[PDB]
Paper text:
Nr5a2 is a key pioneer factor that regulates zygotic genome activation in totipotent embryos, pluripotency in embryonic stem cells and metabolism in adult tissues, but the mechanism of its pioneer activity remains poorly understood. The DBD consists of two modules of Cys4-type zinc fingers, a carboxy-terminal extension (CTE) and a fushitarazu-factor 1 (Ftz-F1) domain. Unlike many other nuclear receptors, Nr5a2 binds as a monomer to its DNA motif, TCAAGG(C/T)CA, on naked DNA and nucleosomes. The nucleosome structure is stabilized by minor groove anchors, which are electrostatic interactions between arginine residues of histones and the DNA minor groove.
To test this, we selected the strong binding site with the motif positioned at SHL +5.5 for subsequent experiments. To exclude the possibility that insertion of the Nr5a2 motif into 601 DNA affects DNA end flexibility, we determined the structure of the NR5A2-unbound nucleosomeSHL+5.5 by cryo-EM and found that it corresponds to the canonical nucleosome structure. In the canonical nucleosome, the minor groove at SHL +5.5 is occupied by the minor groove anchor histone H2A Arg77. The register of DNA in the nucleosomeSHL+5.5 was determined from a high-resolution cryo-EM map region near the dyad axis. To compare the backbone geometries of all histones, the NR5A2–nucleosome complexSHL+5.5 was superimposed on the nucleosomeSHL+5.5. The root mean square deviation (r.m.s.d.) values of the corresponding Cα atoms showed no change on the NR5A2-unbound side; however, the backbone geometries of histones on the NR5A2-bound side were shifted. This suggests that histones are slightly rearranged owing to NR5A2 binding, which could be due to loss of the minor groove anchor and release of DNA from histones.
Residue numbers in the entry:
A (entry chain D), B (entry chain H): 35 to 124
C (entry chain A): 40 to 133
D (entry chain E): 43 to 133
E (entry chain B): 23 to 100
F (entry chain F): 25 to 101
G (entry chain C): 15 to 116
H (entry chain G): 13 to 118
Amino acid sequence: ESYSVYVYKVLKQVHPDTGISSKAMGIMNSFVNDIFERIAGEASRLAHYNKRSTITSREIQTAVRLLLPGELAKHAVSEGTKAVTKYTSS
Amino acid sequence: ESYSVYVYKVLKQVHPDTGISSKAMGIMNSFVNDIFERIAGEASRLAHYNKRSTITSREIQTAVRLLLPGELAKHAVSEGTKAVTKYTSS
Amino acid sequence: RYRPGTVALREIRRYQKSTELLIRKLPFQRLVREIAQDFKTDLRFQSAAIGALQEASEAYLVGLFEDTNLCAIHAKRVTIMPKDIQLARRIRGE
Amino acid sequence: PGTVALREIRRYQKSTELLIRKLPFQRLVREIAQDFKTDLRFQSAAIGALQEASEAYLVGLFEDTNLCAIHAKRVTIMPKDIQLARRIRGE
Amino acid sequence: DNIQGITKPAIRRLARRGGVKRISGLIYEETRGVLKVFLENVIRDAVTYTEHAKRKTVTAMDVVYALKRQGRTLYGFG
Amino acid sequence: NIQGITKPAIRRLARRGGVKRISGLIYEETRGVLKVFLENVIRDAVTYTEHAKRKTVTAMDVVYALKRQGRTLYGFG
Amino acid sequence: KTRSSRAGLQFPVGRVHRLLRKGNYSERVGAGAPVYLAAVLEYLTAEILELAGNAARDNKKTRIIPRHLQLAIRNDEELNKLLGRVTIAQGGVLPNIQAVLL
Amino acid sequence: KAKTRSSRAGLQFPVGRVHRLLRKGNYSERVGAGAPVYLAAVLEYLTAEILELAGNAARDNKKTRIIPRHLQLAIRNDEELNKLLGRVTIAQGGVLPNIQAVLLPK
DNA sequence: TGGAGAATCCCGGTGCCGAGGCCGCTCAATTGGTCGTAGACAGCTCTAGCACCGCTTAAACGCACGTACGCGCTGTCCCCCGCGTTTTAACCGCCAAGGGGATTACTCCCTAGTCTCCAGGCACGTTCAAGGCCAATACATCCTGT
DNA sequence: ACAGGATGTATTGGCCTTGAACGTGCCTGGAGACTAGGGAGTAATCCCCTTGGCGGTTAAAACGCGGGGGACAGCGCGTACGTGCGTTTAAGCGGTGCTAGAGCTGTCTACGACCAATTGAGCGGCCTCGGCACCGGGATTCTCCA
């Protein structure tokens, strides 16, 4: 189980004419795994501090604001909220 | 919920004629909570790495070896093994 | 009249033997609130929160000063300069 | 002495290959591991990871050592510089 | 404004506990800037924690969590 | 086996670090530092290996040890 | 039909939900959290890949190698702050020679 | 008839409370019978070590009560405890007396 | 020296090997239905964070002087650098032989879940021995003229 | 080197307040005895992959020599920071009054966990062809001298 297909689709969206080697795709998989672990751990910690049993979108938003720096966090929050609104409208 | 009673019992075992203040007791409680969290997190990660769903004394032993320095680890392992043996035999 | 350096060593000995806070409390509280105003308005603070902030800040500054003093003796000097703070923070990753 | 040294700095900061021979490193790793467990087997990718990490660590340490040396108004690096960098790093 | 309440004698006292014997005249401004940056980071994290909990008051636990997030654990405040 | 880390190799590592001039006592110091680093990492990796009752040290073990020391490595699993 | 199509994403929403439910993070997981996490991960990957592709295009190359990823990460302040304690295999270093040495 | 699990293991730390804290921190789905007996023993040993050192530090100052200064001195004068608590700040602890040799009078 | 002589960059050829596309299959994601409990909201109580006032005195500020130290300059010498033989051993390709990593099936015993009982730990309400404080005082320490 | 001399500094002895240690009720949380299901401890097998040995080539390591640049010590000068005193400023301490907001309780609902079918998205192999690395071959460009 890896993230190769999705990284490839994102690459073809951003750069429709550039390929990627097999030793860079491992770097990208490691990157995704590390960021997932960071965000999930922070969200779990936030839920534990407040005596809650559920991880919601609010926890993920707060974890993103706590981990990511500066102007990355704002764009990440915008993308997340847009995705959730689109999912709920569907 | 705190660890004051047990810290006091250990104190009167090692130093029968010495007392403790309140801020020192707060520091001791923080210390116990911190080390508990460290060992529990390491044991959880060890269980997740090997695709097991239980935290046994084996994971606690390995976490103690990974976290404590040098002779402290050896003495902690000895104490834990003695406690588990005495518990099982009774 | 004591020579230049004696009172400094005496003060080092005095302040390395005590555990009290070295910054005044009201000015630190005002600074904390002023910094907090740029994140959220109408904020209230518990006393223990500002106490914790003061403890952490003073510990951080003392450690940074120890590293800064180590950087100055490496250059054959006894006077700390901003370059020493800048080098220590660069090596620390800050 | 400036010319060849500067050329080598330019050359080695443009490449990405390993800078330590691989047979000696394997022997060093295996010799160190003997003091923890006897009759140990290594994968051919564990040693590569160890070497990558070691080289990155050493290059960063030398980057810090150079800063200390320049702080002392020198162009040569000395053991005192490594020691100061490691003390400030918390190692 | 309020950064000037961190006075020169206070910084000299802090440097004496770090074992410094002689201090230059340009140290004080640098120290004030460093302290401002450190406080900004810690207070930002603590206020984020406070906002998540739907509260209007910053508590000591928020500061402890923030400091431990920044890798500076503090004993004695809970 | 520590002498297999040669003077030319340490010079190359210093050149990648942007170093112009090197003293003659640097090489032994570098050897010692490398030994300490390797000892810590390998101890943690073999501790991960003894758990799970294996006899072969894997790459994921060294990855876990490096992560546990705050030296996360990408590209090996 | 797929939970990724309803959110306009290319990252798997179901797999993230499975990984959240079996990693011992909480007892319950809400229905919006996988979507948020997948969107954030997709955004970060897109950022890194854009910068790396630009770095590869600066040279006359049409493939991304780890060197381009390293050059992209170190030349951006935000990504450098995020990935500050991470080592990339076969990435090298940024070429910088300090003055006074010339 | 009832006997505590700490009396069975010869401990002073609460095995029953550690068991509850292990099942409510989301560390696994099942917890073994001997894990809280091992963890409690380790915690008790570490507490006893720190308390012994701090009590000696307090007796060396003609005092009969431990204060944070004694804990800080004990932690920073021991090579292994210092490594275990190298990134920890102790409130009202202060620092270790240390002046560099070059700064002393000639 | 603005003339040499290596270093580097720019040009095609090329070939090879690794990325990218195509097809068969299985297992994990989607859908529909139900349930029980976690989170949401309203009403209530009362603790604690904020704000003002006046006095007192401990720090903060300011000022002038003289000294120790930062910084630049110069000289010596020795130790790193660069270069041309020899000499060592890493690297590569090939073959050979078990150790042990990785699955799979069967079975038992260990951990979760429930109900009942009961004692260990927590919140209050006195008290009397630590430790901080104040004069009072004999030593240990710094600086300087001789 | 040394001997007064003013100063900081380590000793007692006596009061003397608060906080540390103790004793009581009582209310949850820990413990005891069953029951039932699946996690994991054991065997057994297959085949990947690790280790070991060997011959040949050649790129890299080692060794020695000769010379210049850089580290380090000594000296002089001048700026600026330490020391001590007299003058302002605001931190600190109480006391009072006032809400804003945090913590707890009760009830009702909608959201998330299970569970059983079902089908297509995503690895796994198998090809196939161009990016890229390499390989010469000129063209162009940095360092040092009459």
